[PDB]
Design a protein around this ligand. Structure first.
Ligand SMILES: [Ca+2]
Ligand SMILES: [Ca+2]
Ligand SMILES: [Ca+2]
Ligand SMILES: [Ca+2]
Lengths: 387, 387, 387, 387
């Protein structure tokens, strides 16, 4: 069982299953995949859609007529399979010209070029029916302190995003932007390193309602942060526009393992959250099948992303519906957490002697939270051990 | 030389020099310090002022008349020395009642009590002339996923801060709030873990203009983040209300080493930033003299905080005034980073063929950034090796 | 089900269930437990035995006659319950005198005292029937570079351990030593920081056969290392004398969560390893019930340590016995990994043209490892999803 | 000043200055360098020598006669400049055939091929006068638990190294082996992850006297470990055969920054150690000029490696020769650390009542270590602030 269907909204970047396995120390282990073949193979596995960078679809430097051809063939594949394109993004990191950034390159002519390369792809994304346009600032940052005045760079980043906003507004496009944060790699430190930094920056843009976040499991974990806590803050702010799902083993290089790999418990708490909150965006996998694998291992890895999400969804649902868990949640006062501290208001609080002057602090101190009992029930549900 | 004076605005918490050296594995190595003796000793060393938690100054559970006495003696010490009190904070972490939090405890009665304990200390802080009231949510978080619904907790945290805002506004107090972020310890994961998360949360409060950040060097480093980059984002947002200075060796327990210890280069880039931006708040040291030390080592450690700031300030000033550095900054196009990408506007950009259609991408790609030359000049200035 | 019995060899330190919840920022949340009550409560839950520091059992500074009394009462409890004492250790970290170390304190008189405090407890451990005597050098290290010449310190550490060896040999005691590594906390950096450093140091002792390791899950993880890989190296060397089981969420302060918490997958791979290798030592839990909990949560947390080990053992056994997994292991060439590279010997290898001159490198390159298929089978077994 | 000469023994890999700037997300930013041009350019800057992988010097798949040609041209360059070749190594990581390892690949035919490729390069290294042959097991490890039985792999790694030993012994070559540890990247976890793990493994080889370590600054730091402490353990064991010098900012991807970048204080403590211990091997830089840089930045970056070592050497010498520092070292009892704990022997210790029964523990406890005073003197020396 645990058979995905298009209704689950599982999507994959072309660059994921298409990763040839070139890493910093080694050559490609797999041949290039034709975009058309990935769309067919992914449709068969039960995915809902694909996502793309401009350069994954249209070889860099293609003439207009080659461009048209490449798009026509891809569109035929989407029509043949029923696959959608809910998101797209720009490659502002591969070509040498972007070595010091796109939107925040020190060189003004490069920043202009980055904006133009981006706008041309927004038009194509809208034509293909994308609802979300992602920006990953992978080259925006520094290896040394004097190379990048961060205040000026944030001025340039605000400027670029406000211009993009102006463009989509003037063209009457129904697309929104999502920033994908990452703390480092390939630059020593990348600007807007976490979901929090991205959420704070968005509030200073001219039209903040057009921008949200595309957080990635492995990225927040590269800073040692709790990914479900970070997603909860994004949901609370109304800014979870998209999500990247994958696996990461702690603080090191960006692994991009299949979803469910890495920190398994954090994966369970994430699915519990997404499903309880009613998140209805795409479930996108930004992952790389390891370079050990041949083409059969590529499709197995991708199928496993989807499988692990669906097993985790069933176990989270079972945990929340268990009457014994419901009672534990009450024993730990989760119900009280949800009630206002002082709906009576500030003067009532100040006059309330049971809040301070006659508050028995030692009796309140003695009450156990019963969190460990709750957590082991959650453990037993994850592992299928409530038999 | 490098002799601090009160004009440098160096401040210290009472709990810093007063730390008795109790750690998770060992007993106190030093006897308690009387608050009056710390104010005298710090004045002699050249500090500008002190900061305090309610409980550092007034033993928990003191009667009103003991409270009055304790305050009177401390005030006499401030008058005798000329020492100021620019910041104060509440202890919402030591007493067992706060084991699941203050403002976000699951138990509503504890959340009420935390608000009342906080307000009573705001009144005292204003009486002593504090301009900034810090909140460190050290118990707000979780060790397990099911213990804390983060959305509800952020509702409770917003509620507490909005109430505090209402209180100071209604009393006509000229005080502002600053949140001190920390990613973990003593809870497994703490809410609002970084400067970015804190900045994003503040934008959802009812009166955001009353709240900013009190970032700490060692805390951001506990997440592997670049502290000067984080301070630059806070300065850009207009939210650097206060700062905690100290040292930390990478990702591990919160060390609170003396300033200049830990990551020395990040300390240089921070001072360069604070001084170039014109930061005029207090230079506060939230540090712990190591428990190896006796009282003579306590005062040496504190004096060193101040010394290292002043050596770093001289070296940063020398770096920025060096004509050879000025020319390197131009060679690396720092001047261009500061100029608008597209002050000509969006239609001009789109019509500009030198931005895309006739942009020579290979020639732009070939230009070296000259960052390594710049960085080694910065190295030579730090080390005093431009002789 | 998953009911522990004494035959499973689950042991707990007295200091684990006895932890009063004092952390660096807060007071105790639970009252002290009498050692006799912990032995009774642990026996009821199904544990095999307990472990102790000298100071957990005999209050520091007790007279000889109080000492005798304390031991007599504890022995009565062991007799009443059938509980064993397979391991013991010395507290060389709590008292202020050990602030710069025990065996590697700069002060020679303290190093002498540490050796004497240790020997007195070895005698008691043997009397109680301990087979393993653990040393955790928690104060051996430094916060600054000039404080500790590491070569000299390693001379002092070798000296202490060689003396201990001489003592047990001269008394004809059948006890061996195990070093518990930890990379940091409470010192900034601790000497012999990982299992590897400890294994290398043991080879330079005069009688290396008397010493091995007591690795802890959470400690190796505080350095970002793979704990099952580390245990495999220890097993390969014949030095896994004991093990500490618990949970840790990545690189931060030492959490000491219940076993199975933290990195769940690493917990599965560890149990798979221990059980396949035939490890027959104690399964000891060095954990701290979180300070949120009352006494009911303390016993629930301890029971969960044991439960999670037994669920993990069942899932690992099922994975290894599955014929489909056996065939996957062959598809990935695990069988070939176990066969000698060159049992034919060096001259045969050099003359073998199929090894170099006629080796088809491109055909070897093309073969997929099929690791992702294998790993998802392992995922399905862990989660109980091979239905 | 701070002008390197060949007598300082600064060496560089061909792959360092030759790095074309291809990273996991981007194409090359610099053209290939001819090995002959790097030898000339490095000689001019004051280096002593170069190091090479087989594949840096002889393009993979070259015929015997092309091989001979490539070697002849390189030898002419070494003769023309006076440059030496003190170390060499094998590329067992780039070609796709090594995707699951060399010596520990699951496939036996690949393990044979790795041994043959290695031996052919040992012959060439000896011909060029290398004294040290380095092995970096960058592909030896795993991304998932079931892919690699670590016990069997350590059997295969021991087997490979014992064969290499047998080869050099039978050929009467005066070369020794050094293992370069790294904890992860490009595999999720790499076998023998730290200096400690490598030192422990060497003690189980048949001729351990032929093998030592080549620790790298940035690698140990990728595990959060103190590099000078690790080098001290290697020196204590007599196994520091070579060293890789570079810079790294904490726990993340392997940066390979120029030496002196990254953790500056750890760089000072390392130079202090190397120079005080009389380390007389090569000072090798395993670094990558950042891909931001053109060829002028490549040579500036390399020159800076050498400059920072020489500034650090002068400051460390000044610290150790300062009579005020000498007295501080005594105040902190560094002299006592170097004296035997119990040269009187075990029975004398046990009979000595001043070691236990009459030891005044509270008076010993009260003595301050004076470490913070010492550390600030070390700070003032580093920064050139003892004027
Ligand atoms: Ca990623
Ligand atoms: Ca701190
Ligand atoms: Ca621990
Ligand atoms: Ca490296």
């Amino acid at each position: 069982n645990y058979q995905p269907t298009p209704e689950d909204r599982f999507t994959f970047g072309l660059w994921t299953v298409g990763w040839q396995g070139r890493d910093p120390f080694g050559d490609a282990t797999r041949r290039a995949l034709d975009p058309v073949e990935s769309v067919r193979r992914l449709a068969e596995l039960g995915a809902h859609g694909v996502t793309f960078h401009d350069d994954d679809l249209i070889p860099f430097g293609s003439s207009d007529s080659e461009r048209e051809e490449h798009v026509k063939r891809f569109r035929q594949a989407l029509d043949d399979t029923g696959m959608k394109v809910p998101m797209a993004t720009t490659n502002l990191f591969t070509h040498p010209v972007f070595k010091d950034g796109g939107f925040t390159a020190n060189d003004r002519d490069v920043r202009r070029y980055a904006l133009r390369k981006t706008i041309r792809n927004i038009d194509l994304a809208v034509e293909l029916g994308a609802e979300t346009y992602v920006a990953w600032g992978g080259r925006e940052g520094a290896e040394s302190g004097g190379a990048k005045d961060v205040r000026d760079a944030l001025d340039r980043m605000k400027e670029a995003f406000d211009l993009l906003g102006e463009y989509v507004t003037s063209q009457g496009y129904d697309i929104r932007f999502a920033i994908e944060p990452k703390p480092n790699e390939p630059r020593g430190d990348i600007l807007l390193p976490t979901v929090g930094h991205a959420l704070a920056f968005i509030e200073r843009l001219e039209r903040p309602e057009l921008y949200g976040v595309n957080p990635e499991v492995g990225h927040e974990q590269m800073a040692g942060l709790n990914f479900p806590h970070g997603i909860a803050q994004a949901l609370w702010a109304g800014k979870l526009f998209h999500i990247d799902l994958n696996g990461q083993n702690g603080i090191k290089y960006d692994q991009d393992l299949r979803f469910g790999a890495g920190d398994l418990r954090a994966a369970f708490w994430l699915v519990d959250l997404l499903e309880s909150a009613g998140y209805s965006g795409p479930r996108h996998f930004d992952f790389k099948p390891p370079r050990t694998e041949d083409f059969d291992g590529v499709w197995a890895s991708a199928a496993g992303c989807m499988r692990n999400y669906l097993i985790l969804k069933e176990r989270a649902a079972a945990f929340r519906a268990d009457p014994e868990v419901q009672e534990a949640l009450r024993a730990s006062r989760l119900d009280e957490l949800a009630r206002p501290t002082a709906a009576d208001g500030l003067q009532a609080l100040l006059d309330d002697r049971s809040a301070f002057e006659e508050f028995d602090v030692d009796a309140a101190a003695a009450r156990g939270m019963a969190f460990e009992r709750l957590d082991q029930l959650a453990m037993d549900h994850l592992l299928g051990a409530r038999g």
